[PDB]
Design a protein around this ligand. Structure first.
Ligand code: NAD
Ligand code: NAD
Ligand code: NAD
Ligand code: NAD
Lengths: 337, 336, 337, 336
């Protein structure tokens, strides 16, 4: 009768989800990754190029990963249907492999003994949630497979909600200037499904499609047809920034925009949306747990109804924190039985 | 009876202007830079981290830089009033130091012997020009000091002109995702006039100003109050991209946008504005001489009146070619 | 009765081998890569983040890649035994996939119709060659599967040959400061066989084992037991540098070392070993076709018998040129029938 | 009756020295930097691209920088002779500007009121110290201006001492693969005193000098003529690694090398020299306070008398901690 968590895919998100669970006191009972044995998991969790050394103890024994004296079972399965989730008492599962994105693909975790699945990416069909925006729409009795959307959606949606509710978004287009990720290549190589994404990640500014802005209209249905966008991948290893250009229905002097964002940050979006007026740059958000940090000085108003709003996000770390927040939220709701 | 060019500030722009002049047959008679001696100028011109080795001969002798057998006088002065422009026959001067941006600061070149000055950046008061957009407003009678605007302005203005003339820009905002430059720092250091610009250039996405925010509506006055924008400096050493989000007056389905850009690129803006449908990334424009290369596949439309348009530019190389094109244009008009 | 070439694995080396063949007038009859279709091959060959746009025409039609009007057959096979080399008249095959490194693995090309194979990497057992060092040891009648060693070996061996023959190498240890490659990761990810190599390539200086110095003693047997070394992978996308610290038998004033290197560069190692006294840095060798460029000003002599010698190499481009040179050499020798 | 510290040059080293002082309870009474005002110092100290946000409070008021409630006077002088060190009670001064390296240049601090000066770089003439190697040679009677050598010297000297004392270094040569620094350039620009250092720092592997080449045999005189080396600057923003290739007198099988380093790290060089057998890379040492971290698995031996030894260092952070350790050592010795 406590939340327990299983992680499938011990990657950037998977490992940082474990870090967040340790920080928040969420019990992780098992990790599955066929490419990382237990001894190697210790190394990959202990040392991080982006987020530093884990501040605590990491060891292995008895085929287990032991973090701050918490024993975590380690499985080595290539397919969700192979994973023995029943053995660790039917945990809530984070699907962070990147390759099981549909209800059908993720449902094999349920039949292998998972109580619920949270897909750590947009899904073509599983219901999507962004904490601070639409988590109340989760239904414990009808949804065992959900999605926590993307990092970009988690940055954009809270800001879009604040702005739309105060001023009215008539239409908006967004760009994210985004750090490279594990799907990209060190040098020019094959990416048949998205050719630009094969090009050397460290050498290039790379345009890339993203459903993340429209995704904000799955989580904020009033914005259907009113928001879309795209990405540029650039040579930084973490932290990204949303640039939202929108036309507003009611006049929105920039002072009124700042006040609305601050009010949201201090109140209902505390911990999700933050507000700064400092002269920040991307590294200043390494390790930041917010979904969206509004950059007051970087935005521009052409006029009272046409503005460019800028918001930062640690795409690895903020998102991993939201995965945990969504799990905890789901569990508190699922207690409705 | 012929165009001759002097360069003040033998930097990224100054050296690439000399390369462009060599490519386009324009005679450079002198280069001034107090921080680079002739023998050192050979090395800095011969080897380039971004644009490769100079394909030709580079030597020094008799206090001169010699490129492909052309002798270039080398001066070593810290202030424009010190430079002996009269000794090399009153050249047209490129002001590419970054620190003499006003008519007042640049006029010292004229009184030191320069025939004309082209400031290689936006100016608070000198008239600004973008080839393909407003060069015809140059008035030989009354403009001895001019500006070639900025690299971003040279990318944005040709595209904005095409879109505005075809569909009508009601309002627009732009971003440039821009390579780092010489004003930035390798590691966090002082930049009291722009604090974010001091932060390590290779480590950060850095919000910043763009010269295009102010310059674009000087060169296209009809857009005054309808367009501005900002930059993010990112960890690439050259090539940048404009992302222009605009609301349009006339219906602008994306097929019509593509046909409008193509027409401009094949016609009046040939050599200035190009058009691609290839799956391009920033390195694909290293050494491209165009001002603006419209990326058809990267753009997105929300609807027929609200669109995001993407256009690339080699911020060092395209702009340097435009400096040379402006000089040749001025010289031809000065014969009136 | 002309050299014809088949490429297996159209990667950094595979594509740059095709560029070199075009430059040198070597006929490439076919390319095989299961991850790159013909239309996508056009794109990957045309545009290069490191070496610029291909200067010529690239098109596809009739299931073929057409470069400067030369038609090249394109195959899409995952295993060497699947490739129809007989269909294109028994070419000499470049094995540049990175995954068929042994005589046994590469021999399937022979049974599929390849006349010879050149493995574009060190082999555990195929005989290895470095142009300018030991190519004369190739035997047309006994070797159908050979190796062109590695980029580092191709840089080190020519210099080591010059120095050993003039002064005598008593012992030497080398480091290569080397650009990242396709085997590395954009962000921290799994590399179970070599853990450091999983760490983000763009963020880190990464120590990495290399058999490349000892490899110089397979190609220069007199140096057995006398040379080994290691690598640091660093955040550049191409071009690397050898730093060889050696104790010499005969006194070797640095002026005598420079003269020996120059004599080799102007004479028997022309096109293989070059010599500069300019104030060069890594980008200055992008596109350089030499195996080894000796940096006169960067080296140090502690004394007449103990020195550190520095030599540059474009690891992608120089090596790709040597693959072609070795093919042409093999073919001229194989004419012995 | 207590150590007080003044910092001249509030740069990478100056700010990280203030961080180290805050961590180690050392009182900083003043900071001087003509290029950073108090309000700007708050920002530059609070936010760090490499080492993260300062974990504490940072404010300005009354012309002062206030860190965790400690008031620090802020001066704005361009020359040491201008700095009012007497106003803050004759502090021990860190000279971390990079431009006052000689006894003669640094002595102006003494005549302006400094009790002592620690130059944060090798000096042509001031006596140089490496903690764990030769600090005992400091003579309070006769050394008011000293140097803490360089970061590479602080990595190399402790390891060289251990190896030489155990096995005897016959001869050695070293390389440091070193992160870029503030002296380097974002894009190819002028560096007339060291041409390769002008080339774009983020694009290139750059051969360069290391302060350790000359400094190591000043701090370990027994190695004079037996050790020198060079650097390659590469595209990382912090952390560097020494690669020491030496011929040894006594048999040195690699197991014995490991036991010798371990013994030093656990004993007399605790906090200075560390020892790891983990599969480490450069980022793993961000924020490490040790001078030298021996990488057991990365090294290689050709034979029992010829070996290559690898040791890491956070060039910014480890060195800044050593500056503070040297100041505290000097202060304790000055009580004699
Ligand atoms: N990195 C980001 O910024 C980010 C942010 C939000 C969401 N996401 C999403 O999170 C998911 C993972 O992203 P990542 O960045 O962590 O990628 P990653 O490549 O770092 O991690 C994927 C992990 O999954 C493991 N794996 C692969 N196949 C597996 C399988 N069949 N079974 C079990 N494990 C398998 C890999 O070995 C690896 O450790 C993706 O859907 C991604 O879109 C990423
Ligand atoms: N780099 C770009 O992308 C780009 C593009 C368009 C325009 N610009 C503008 O061009 C100008 C030069 O920029 P850059 O990127 O070439 O900078 P840079 O730092 O590379 O070049 C400036 C050069 O001026 C020399 N210099 C400095 N002070 C001088 C003086 N007082 N007198 C003579 N020479 C002096 C320097 O030694 C250096 O060689 C700036 O105004 C910049 O805004 C830059
Ligand atoms: N890049 C260098 O600096 C360098 C230099 C010298 C030698 N090498 C060696 O050359 C070889 C290739 O290196 P690379 O850098 O070009 O790697 P790469 O990853 O860029 O290229 C490998 C190519 O092989 C293809 N491939 C993968 N599996 C295949 C298969 N089963 N059949 C056919 N094709 C397949 C991939 O799709 C890819 O295009 C490796 O052995 C490498 O060690 C690399
Ligand atoms: N960065 C490293 O890894 C490192 C390590 C060890 C030692 N050092 C040495 O430390 C010194 C500082 O290096 P850094 O990397 O901190 O450089 P830096 O450029 O970051 O810092 C120098 C600071 O001095 C200030 N300054 C410049 N001129 C001044 C003057 N005349 N008076 C007062 N302040 C002035 C600058 O505004 C800047 O804040 C150099 O001697 C360097 O060799 C650097």
């Amino acid at each position: 009768r406590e939340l327990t968590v299983g992680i499938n895919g011990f990657g950037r998100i998977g490992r940082l989800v474990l870090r967040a669970c340790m920080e928040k006191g969420v019990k992780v009972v098992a990790v599955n990754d066929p490419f990382i044995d237990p001894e190697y998991m210790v190394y990959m969790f202990k040392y991080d190029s982006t987020h530093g050394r884990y501040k605590g103890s990491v060891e292995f024994r008895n085929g287990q990963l032991v973090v701050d004296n918490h024993e975590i079972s380690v499985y080595q399965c290539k397919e969700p249907k192979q994973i023995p989730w029943r053995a660790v008492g039917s945990p809530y599962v984070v699907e962070s492999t990147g390759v099981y994105l549909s209800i059908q693909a993720a449902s094999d975790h349920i039949s292998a003994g998972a109580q619920r699945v949270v897909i750590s990416a947009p899904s073509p069909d599983a219901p999507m949630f962004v904490m601070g925006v639409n988590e109340n729409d989760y239904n414990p009795g009808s949804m065992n497979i959900v999605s926590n959307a993307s990092c970009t959606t988690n940055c954009l949606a809270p800001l879009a909600k604040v702005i739309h509710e105060r001023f009215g978004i008539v239409e908006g287009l967004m760009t994210t200037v985004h750090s490279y990720t594990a799907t990209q290549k060190t040098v020019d190589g094959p990416s048949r499904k998205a050719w630009r994404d094969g090009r050397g990640a460290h050498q290039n500014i790379i345009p890339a499609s993203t459903g993340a802005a429209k995704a904000v209209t799955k989580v904020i249905p009033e914005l259907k047809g009113k928001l879309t966008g795209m990405a540029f991948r650039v040579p930084t290893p973490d932290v990204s920034v949303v640039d939202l250009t929108c036309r507003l229905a009611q006049p929105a002097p920039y002072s009124a925009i700042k006040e609305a964002v601050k009010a949201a940050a201090k109140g209902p979006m505390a911990g999700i949306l933050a507000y700064t007026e400092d002269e920040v740059v991307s590294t200043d958000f390494l390790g930041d747990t917010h979904s969206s940090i509004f950059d007051a000085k970087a935005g521009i108003a052409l006029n009272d109804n046409f503005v460019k709003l800028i918001s930062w996000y640690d795409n690895e770390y903020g998102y991993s924190h939201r995965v945990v927040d969504l799990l905890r939220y789901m569990f508190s709701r699922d207690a409705e039985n």
